[PDB]
């Protein structure tokens, strides 16, 4: 009866190792009585206990006392600064004002010297149909400096999470089972041309950096190569990261993205090393941080969003009663421990050539304890954790996440590490992800996994009944802020597309953070993902019919060469005209938020179709005739030119 209070309390106990020297009892076992707790040091949901005719309520109180005693005996151990970073001291000009409780705020340096706006064409397309933009949810809002200081105190300002003893030994036991020995010690850095190929010249400037990436590349490339050598030999350098709030002017991505969802998952606190330091890290570790080739099992950072759910359902279909168990770690970046970072270090040393291990052993040391500069000049010393702007973020988090989840899953079920790829499939993109396995294993892992994942220091989001999110049918999987939605093509074949709430799609489509060429690029980018949504599909076509003489802009996720309907068929595998049905039920779910907020009218759907037909019945070759129902209504079809989709 009193069993849950033990389970909730067990999520607060310090991680311990196997203690065979005493009796280790379960949370349900404690609720049965005749058991008095002997230590709040917990291991796999068990604690050392003695049998002594106890009342349950007493056992909890002794545990509450055991835990409270330790909490007031293991708080403020103390923050220390590493010598290799002493150089930052000489830069303080004023006293510190962060009022941090767990990390040093040694002072402030001297300072140096964006709005949410609507896309004029798209927005005029929506409004003309009765969509009320004001009713759409806010997206990509910025935050004030006072919330920023409190945000850092709220989420960053935390000591490293305690982890189970010897864990990283076990995590290496898992990695050895999925190493790719045909590549051991085979990675080398790439040359300047390969690095500059896929790069944004507008890469974010450091706090002490004046020039962007494109400027740093065009003129100070020699400076970057100097950084590498000092690291190549194990020499300290001026490592610092700049802290700005998400959607500040310098929240700019160095590398390509798969969609707007990546920006949505960025923490409230963006932390990145200098443009020059990022370039040095990227030129050296290119094959890792960009996962070329992919050696992280189930890493979907390169999988385009329109492929992922087709790719997964092919795995889904091979199980007897599959479930998908979601990973939902609370603010992952703040939970990377120092010991976790050397686990990636020891892994990066595995795949890199012998001539770079000193580089890695050194750069890890800096990342063990990083000096960070706020936008306003306040300086704090972060104990470990992952900076969202580091080049190793997605690569390092992803490989970190798989090992951690496999450990939690395998130890929860009894499945041996070497047998995993046989009884389960996993897919991750940074901290977000899930695993597929049989309902038996999935329900077992989902119930015990929350506590185990607390013992490894990756606490999950508080959920109902302390159980991980379990998907029992395919299109309930949630991944990368999207979810599978079925479509049936004209040839009676089925595929899945990335589904998402209609409200969210409209908002992210109608806005930007501070031209008509751009809006056609957005229209195409959204069309590749959301052609299942008849509202979006037709809005997108209308924008594409707008001033056909203009070429599409190239600043966003995708753009097209030539006729766009061809580009759709090139990557999707079917012509847009072949979309005959969108999954009936799932569309109802995703459109509900539209009616919840009242963002549309009872005739909005019809007014949009009727708006598209008006442009479509006129004689000639019109984009809107790609829509099967529009073409069914106009009697004419769209005949595509040549087309190609490019990033």
Numbering used by the authors: 13 to 125, 131 to 531, 538 to 670
Give sentences copied directly from the paper behind this entry:
To better understand the nature of the NTD–RdRP intra-molecular interface interactions and whether they regulate the RdRP fidelity, we designed point mutations at the Y471 and E472 sites in the context of the WT NS5B and the N- and C-terminal deletion mutants. Crystallization screenings were performed for all the NTD containing mutant constructs and four of them were successfully crystallized with one construct crystallized under two different conditions. Among these five structures, three of them (Y471A and two forms of C-672_Y471A) maintain the WT conformation with the NTD–RdRP intra-molecular interface maintained.
Compared to the RdRPs of other Flaviviridae representatives such as the NS5 of the Japanese encephalitis virus (JEV) and dengue virus (DENV) in the Flavivirus genus and the NS5B of the hepatitis C virus (HCV) of the Hepacivirus genus, the pestivirus NS5B contains a unique ∼90-residue N-terminal domain (NTD) that does not have notable sequence homology to any other viral or host proteins. The global conformation of our CSFV NS5B structures is consistent with the recently reported CSFV structure with an RMSD value of 0.9 Å (95% coverage) between the reported structure and our representative C-682 structure. These structures together reveal that the NTD adopts a globular α/β fold with an α-β-α-β-β-α pattern. The NTD interacts with the palm of the RdRP core intra-molecularly with a mixture of hydrophobic and hydrogen bonding interactions. Collectively, these biochemical data indicated that the RNA synthesis fidelity of CSFV NS5B is fine-tuned by its NTD through the intra-molecular interactions with the RdRP palm.
